[PDB]
Structure formats: structure tokens, C-alpha cells
Amino acid sequence: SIDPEKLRDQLLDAFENKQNELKSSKAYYDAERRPDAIGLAVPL
Amino acid sequence: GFSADHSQIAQTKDTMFTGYLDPVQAKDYFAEAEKTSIVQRVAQKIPMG
Amino acid sequence: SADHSQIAQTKDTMFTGYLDPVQAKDYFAEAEKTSIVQRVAQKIPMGATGIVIPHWTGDVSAQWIGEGDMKPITKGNMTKRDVHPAKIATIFVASAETVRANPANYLGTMRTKVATAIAMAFDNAALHGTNAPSAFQGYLDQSNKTQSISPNAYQGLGVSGLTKLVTDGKKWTHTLLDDTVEPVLNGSVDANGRPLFVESTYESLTTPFREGRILGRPTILSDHVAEGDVVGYAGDFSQIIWGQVGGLSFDVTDQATLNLGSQESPNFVSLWQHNLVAVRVEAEYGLLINDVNAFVKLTFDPVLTTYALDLDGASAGNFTLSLDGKTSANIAYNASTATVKSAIVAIDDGVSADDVTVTGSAGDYTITVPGTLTADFSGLTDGEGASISVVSVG
């Protein structure tokens, strides 16, 4: 068996770290300010 | 008893039978089980790179 | 890289003629030398553990008795001897593009050449003992017996040589001969000058030179059996056993590191960084000769024999030398070089003070003599571990 209140917290921390990958894919399908898109010749 | 390789009697201890009647290899009946981390059991795991 | 190095193949001088109208394989190279002992000794199963050979030995016996005489008691006996394998190995190295090119099929040819060298090293270790690993027990030249065959082979083998075996109670089952023996068989003649070993009008090759038997015993021929002054053997080849733990086991790398120098003074080269391929080869033979005295060495004309006599640790009593079975008077372990010479020439037959030679200090003698020499050390009252061996032709 496994502790379900442990599983709650353990999976919740697994999910909440995973979301950071997903933000890097969201930022292409809707246009966030990607850092690599900035055209370097434009003055600051 | 009689001498370690007596001149008139055959015995299990005689030099003549070395390489026969060898003791059998057993398992370790006193295998102390491996220790394992307590810190990795109590502390909260996080992802890493 | 380290171009034209003695230790690696790199488009060195050899490949100056390559990838042009070169004349095939050449018409002059001899075939690869086969092993010899591997076709006359029985192959015995060998594990990486080595093996134990048991042996009976006990002089168990019975007695005649009268009626009502109480019956005697007896005990048998046994003993054991161990045999171990030993490794033989080599490495060879070439530039990776040399391996892609494979000029003159060199990386293929090399695998045949190392196999021949490894086979030859086993036969040299068995016959003459030249570099034998400490695990090999006995070699054929270590025999205390010799025979000449020069005037004709028939008297040499079938009469004199066989006498020197059966007098020791050891039998003759095979004979092994080098190609250089062919003139003394072709020259083996009766008093009229007819050859013994070939029939009239002389078309056929001489009988033993077709691997025909001599006086019942098979003949084994070779192109490389001869060494020093010995041209072949006669004896009980059932007394030899050999094994091989596994095959020649070629292995290869583009990525390891080699020491081109020595353990005492290294010279490392990376195979990866200099872009070289290396091949690793090993085999794991093993050998036992039950009794090296069971063989007559054959010699192309008469020779002396020389022996090392070892009395290490001898501290009390006397030792007895014997020539062709005739015992000397006993000798002290502390006796002079000239005392030993005077004792051996005091054997009642054939010996002389001008043909026999003795050299070295007390207890460490070297004896040079026209015959088979044997020793009894049982008159040493303390300091066992004394020994005798042949060491060369005289």
C-alpha cells in the first residue's frame, strides 16, 4: 500500500514542476514575448 | 584412535583421500541485510538538472 | 601520426606498390607451418580452473599361507597431480585508414601469421622448452636418452634405439621425424648398396616419408621438428596430454590506449587521439608429459650428453651415480670436481679419462658423458630435494 495524503502532496509537487515545460510551448501557440525573437539591430 | 595415515587401516582423514569428501558450500545463514538511506525516506524529493 | 614507427602500420615502405597492376599473390611463398604436437598428443578437456589427475600407487599384496595360519593385513594407496593452463598473446596496430584500405590484405593476412606464430610457440614450448611458461610440466628434449641414426636408420631405430627404451621398461609406439632426415633414410643401405626403405626401380618415395609405419609404429613427419642437433623422437606418445581453454579469440579497438614502451618505463599512445586501430589476440594452452624419460632423442650423427647435478640442501651421507645402468661407487656431497670425474670413469665399461668431462663446484656439478646418466640420492642421510636434469647436447 501507499499513503494517499503522501501521494496527494507527492503528485501535486510532480504536477507543479511539470507546468514549467508547458509554458515554453504555450509561448509559441499564443504569442508571448519570447526572448530569442528580439531583432538585435533595433536600438534599445 | 589411530595415526593420521595409519599403515594398515583406511580412514576418511588419510592423506590418500584429499580432494574427495570436501565440505559442501552453503548459503550465508547470517547475511546481515543491507542498510539503506533514511534521509531519502523522510525528505521531500524535488526534480533536478 | 607517429609515421613509419616500428610498432604500428601507417603507409610505411611496404605499401609503395599498392592499388595498381601488382602481380596477384606471389608464386614463391611457402604454406603456413601447421602445429605438430597438437596432431600426436591426445587432446584432453581443460577448464580455466585446470584439472586434477588421480593416480593409483599402492603396492597391495597377498601371501601364501598354511592351514590355520592367521591371514595377513594390507592397505592400498593413491596420489594426485594438478595441471594448469597458461596464456599466450600478442597485439598488432595499424592506422584506421590502413584498416579501411586493407593493402595487400594485411589486416587479414596478419590474423593468419599470428595464428602460426602462436601455434609454433606451443610446439617450441613442448619440444625444446625454449620459452615454456612455468605451468607446463616437462618438454621432449628433457629426456635422459639419445640415439644416433647416421650409417642407416634401421639399426638406429629398430635395434639400438628400441633397446634403450625396453631396457627401461618403457615401450615404443610412434616416431616423429624432421624433413632433414630424408637423406639418411634414402642412404640406409644393405651391404650390396640396395636401400632398405624403398623397393626395386625406385619410383616410389621412401616408405616412412609417405607417413608409412616402421616396424609396426606409425611415422609422423614435420618441416620444423629439428633443433640444435636433434632431428626427431621415438617413444610412447600416449604419455603426453594437452588442452586449450578457448579459441584464438581475436578482439579489436579504435579507442583504447597502449604502452609502446615497458612497465618499468612507459610510452603511452592513445589509439583514439592518434587514430590507430589495434587487434588483441590470446589463447590458453596447457600441457603435461607424464614421464619425459619415455622418449629417445634422435641425432643425425653421434653426440655427447650433458647434465646438471643438483645437491641443494644436502648435508649428510653419500650419493650414487649410474651410467647406462652400471652404478659407480658412492660419492660424498662435498666431493671435488676431479673426484666425481675419477668416480664416473671407475665404472667398469667403455668410459675414459680423455672423453668424459666434469665441471663446476662441489654439490653443483655438471657432467658431460657418452651415455644415459641416472642418480640415486637415497644414501643422503639429510638434505633431500637433490635432483638431476639434462641441460644441452654436450
* Distance, CA of C350 to CA of C228 (rounded, Å): 26
User: What would you measure as the largest C-alpha separation in chain B, in angstroms?
Assistant: 78
DSSP state of C40: T
Q: Which residues of B touch A19 (CB under 8 A)?
A: none
How many angstroms separate the first and last alpha carbons of chain B? 74
> How many C-beta atoms surround the C-beta of residue B23 within 10 A?
5
Q: Name the helix (H) or strand (E) containing A5.
A: helix A4-29
- The residue among C322, C309, C313, C318 whose CA lies nearest residue C366 is C309
The grid cell for C98 is 590502413
* Distance, CA of A37 to CA of A43 (rounded, Å): 15
Tell how strand C174-178 and strand C219-222 pair up: parallel
Q: Determine contact: A12 vs chain B, CB below 8 A.
A: no
Distance set, CA C310 to CA C313, C315, C323, C353, C389 (Å): 9, 13, 17, 23, 8
Contact, C298 vs C101, CB < 8 A? Answer: no
φ/ψ of B38, rounded to 5, equals: -90, -35
Exposure string for C5-29, b = 16+ CB within 10 A, e = fewer? eeebbbbeeeeeeeeeeeeeeeeee
Q: Which residues of B touch A17 (CB under 8 A)?
A: 46-47
Of B8, B16, B17, the CB nearest to C73: B8
* Distance, CA of B10 to CA of C77 (rounded, Å): 9
Q: Which residues of C touch B5 (CB under 8 A)?
A: none
Distance set, CA C304 to CA B6, C176, C355, C374 (Å): 47, 22, 9, 15
Contact, C161 vs C217, CB < 8 A? Answer: no
Three-class DSSP category at C310: strand
φ/ψ of C355, rounded to 5, equals: -90, -40
Test the C interface: residue of B12, B14, B16 with most C CBs within 10 Å = B16
Three-class DSSP category at C89: strand
* Distance, CA of C286 to CA of C84 (rounded, Å): 6
As beta bridge partners, residue C282 has C89
> How many C-beta atoms surround the C-beta of residue C372 within 10 A?
21
Q: For C81, name the nearest residue in chain B, comparing CA atoms only.
A: B19
Q: Name the helix (H) or strand (E) containing C63.
A: none
| CB contact (8 A) between residue B7 and residue C75 | yes
Distance set, CA C314 to CA A3, A11, C282, C330 (Å): 82, 85, 43, 14
- The residue among C382, C340, C379, C329 whose CA lies nearest residue C363 is C340
Contact, C157 vs C234, CB < 8 A? Answer: yes
Contact, B10 vs C75, CB < 8 A? Answer: yes
The grid cell for C70 is 592367521
Q: Determine contact: B7 vs chain C, CB below 8 A.
A: yes
Tell how strand C146-148 and strand C295-299 pair up: parallel
Can you tell me which residue has the cell 514542476?
A17
* Phi-psi map region of C185: left, alpha, beta (phi>0 left; psi -120 to 50 alpha): alpha
Could you tell me which residues come within 8 angstroms of residue C4 by beta carbon, excluding any fewer than 6 positions away? C10, C12, C13
Alpha-carbon Rg for chain B in angstroms: 27
C188-C191-C193-C199 Cα dihedral, nearest 10 degrees: -70
Alpha helices, DSSP H only, in chain C?
A: 96-101, 106-127, 153-154, 162-166, 182-186, 337-344
Which 3-state string (H, E, C) describes C191-206?
CCCCECCCCCCCCCCC
Exposure string for C188-214, b = 16+ CB within 10 A, e = fewer? beeeeeebbbbeeeeeeebbbbeeeeb
* Distance, CA of C88 to CA of C284 (rounded, Å): 6
Tell how strand C326-327 and strand C380-382 pair up: unpaired
Distance set, CA B17 to CA B4, C14, C192 (Å): 12, 62, 64
As beta bridge partners, residue C195 has C189
* Distance, CA of C119 to CA of C268 (rounded, Å): 30
The grid cell for C267 is 610510452
As beta bridge partners, residue C52 has C82
Task: Report the gap between the CA of C75 and the closest CA in chain B (Å).
Answer: 5
* Distance, CA of C330 to CA of C334 (rounded, Å): 12
* Distance, CA of C374 to CA of C164 (rounded, Å): 13
> How many C-beta atoms surround the C-beta of residue A41 within 10 A?
4
Q: What is the DSSP string of B4-45?
A: TT-SS---TTSGGGTTSSPPPPPP-TT-PPPP--SHHHHSPP
Q: For B7, name the nearest residue in chain C, comparing CA atoms only.
A: C75
Could you tell me which residues come within 8 angstroms of residue C205 by beta carbon, excluding any fewer than 6 positions away? C198
Question: Which amino acid is present at B12?
Answer: T
* Distance, CA of C358 to CA of C344 (rounded, Å): 9
* Distance, CA of C237 to CA of C54 (rounded, Å): 20
Contact, C220 vs C177, CB < 8 A? Answer: yes
Contact, C341 vs C353, CB < 8 A? Answer: yes
Q: What is the DSSP string of C325-383?
A: TEEPPPEETT--HHHHHHHHTTSSSS--TTT-EEESSTTS-EEEESS-EEEE-TTEEE-
* Distance, CA of B18 to CA of C78 (rounded, Å): 10
DSSP state of C59: -
| CB contact (8 A) between residue B45 and residue A17 | no
| CB contact (8 A) between residue B47 and residue A10 | no
| CB contact (8 A) between residue C80 and residue B19 | yes
Chains B vs C: touching, with 3+ CB pairs under 8 Å? yes
Q: Which residues of B touch C49 (CB under 8 A)?
A: none
Gaps in chain A following residue numbers (C to N > 2.5 A): none
* Distance, CA of C208 to CA of C177 (rounded, Å): 9
| CB contact (8 A) between residue B46 and residue A10 | no
DSSP state of A26: H
